[PDB]
Curated annotation (Swiss-Prot), chains A, B, C, D, E:
Source taxon at top rank: Eukaryota
Recorded domain comment: The 'non A-beta component of Alzheimer disease amyloid plaque' domain (NAC domain) is involved in fibrils formation. The middle hydrophobic region forms the core of the filaments. The C-terminus may regulate aggregation and determine the diameter of the filaments.
Residues at which Cu cation binds: 27
Species of origin: Homo sapiens
Protein's UniProt name: Alpha-synuclein
Tissue expression notes: Highly expressed in presynaptic terminals in the central nervous system. Expressed principally in brain.
Residues of the full protein shown: 15 to 96 of 140
Higher taxonomy: Eukaryota, Metazoa, Chordata, Craniata, Vertebrata
Function in brief: Neuronal protein that plays several roles in synaptic activity such as regulation of synaptic vesicle trafficking and subsequent neurotransmitter release. Participates as a monomer in synaptic vesicle exocytosis by enhancing vesicle priming, fusion and dilation of exocytotic fusion pores. Mechanistically, acts by increasing local Ca(2+) release from microdomains which is essential for the enhancement of ATP-induced exocytosis.
Cysteine-cysteine disulfides: none
């Protein structure tokens, strides 16, 4: 499991957000197990979780994610 | 499990957020187990979790995530 | 499990946030176990968790995360 | 488990936050176990947890996190 | 478990925060065990936990975290 990222090197990248919420519940990244023998979970990269959610220019550079999730029996 | 990142080297990158919430519950990253024999969990990279959530220019440089999540029996 | 990061080397990177919340509960990163034999958990990288949450220019440099989470039996 | 970071070398990096909260509960990073035989937990990198939470330019330099979390039986 | 960091070498890095909270409870980093045989926990890097929380330019230099958390039986 290898990840390699290389980077070699008027409004830009500008954001405006206004949010109004009376009641927000947000769970993000959740793993829940009830009575379960094996759970294997991987979350990789960018997760944005909002009642209001904005992602802008998330990977302007090089981004690499490598995952190997699992079991051997 | 190897990750390598290399970086070699008017408004830009400017954000404005206004948020109003009467009641917020936010869970971020959560692993919950109840009565479970094995749980294996990996969270990698950037997680933003908000009632209002903004990510801007998260990986302008090189970003690498490598994960190996699991069990051998 | 090896991570290597290398870096070699008008408003920019400017943010404004206003937040108003009457009641906030925020859990960040949580692992909860109740009656569970094995829990293995890894959280890596940047987690931002807010009723209002902003991440800007999180990895302008090189960022590397390597994780190996798990069990051998 | 080895991590190596190398760094070799108008408003910039400027932030303004105003927050007003009547009631805040924030948990940060929490591991809770009740009646659990084994818990293994790793939290790495930057976690920001707020009713209002801002991360800006978290890794302008090189950042490396390596984790090996788990058990051998 | 080895971590190595090397560093070789108009407003910049300027922040303004105003916060008003009537009631704040903040838990930071917490490990709680009740009736649990084994808990192994590692928290590494920077955790900022606030009713209002700001992290700016957390790792302008090189930062390395290496963790090996776990048990051998």
């Amino acid at each position: 499991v290898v990840a390699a990222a290389e980077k070699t090197k008027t409004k830009e990248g500008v954001l405006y957000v206004g949010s109004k919420t009376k009641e927000g519940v947000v769970h993000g990244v959740a793993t829940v197990a009830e009575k379960t023998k094996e759970q294997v979970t991987n979350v990789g990269g960018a997760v944005v979780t909002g009642v209001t959610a904005v992602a802008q220019k998330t990977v302007e550079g090089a981004g690499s994610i490598a995952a190997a999730t699992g079991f051997v029996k």
